[PDB]
Amino acid sequence: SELRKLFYSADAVCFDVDSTVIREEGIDELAKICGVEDAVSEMTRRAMGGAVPFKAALTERLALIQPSREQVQRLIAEQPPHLTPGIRELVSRLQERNVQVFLISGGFRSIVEHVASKLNIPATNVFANRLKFYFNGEYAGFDETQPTAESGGKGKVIKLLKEKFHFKKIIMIGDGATDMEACPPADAFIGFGGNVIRQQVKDNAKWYITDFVELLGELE
Ligand SMILES: [Ca+2]
Ligand SMILES: [Ca+2]
């Protein structure tokens, strides 16, 4: 109710992707497709929270994976991530109210833009890391000048959105400590535990939900 008043006052909503908009972690799914799920999956857990320098953790994880372009294509085509229940309807209600919706991820644009298309979110509204490939398709690194490539990158994205569009009320929605750490500069943060409860987030967030339906505030 009071959460509904908050949610309805936003003119922009930024969603974390991994474990919020989708059930999975995009990089762990890619690691599965490339055959090193075990090591990378725990490296990803080890980075969760404000725990390690993100950029180093991403280099090491990708150095084990070595994803080729055709492997990224196969992931998107054959093992696409699962949208969290309710998120399709939630983004639809937001877009019908002219709230600008963004996706922000430390994952990868190829995957996140696939997710955005399913949600009618334009690619201009997607902020993620960009994989590089050689002419033959072999993994060649990633763009380190992206804000999402560095620790604190979600906060840097939101700051860039404020400067570009002058939004008066930007809300960050996400499951982890780095999402909670994006407020400020976000105006409010709503923790999400529908896929996995991070107790550290749930204990310290003013707003926390476990089911995307809870923000649907008028049953239509
Ligand atoms: Ca997340
Ligand atoms: Ca911050």
From Swiss-Prot:
Phenotype for T178V: Reduces L-phosphoserine phosphatase activity by about 25%
Residues that coordinate or bind O-phospho-L-serine: M48, S105, G106, G107, K154, T178
Annotated compartments: Cytoplasm, Cytosol
Cofactor note: Binds 1 Mg(2+) ion per subunit.
Cofactor(s) listed in the protein's UniProt record: Mg(2+)
Binding site for phosphate: G49, T178
Enzyme class: hydrolase
Record protein name field: Phosphoserine phosphatase
Species, as recorded: Homo sapiens
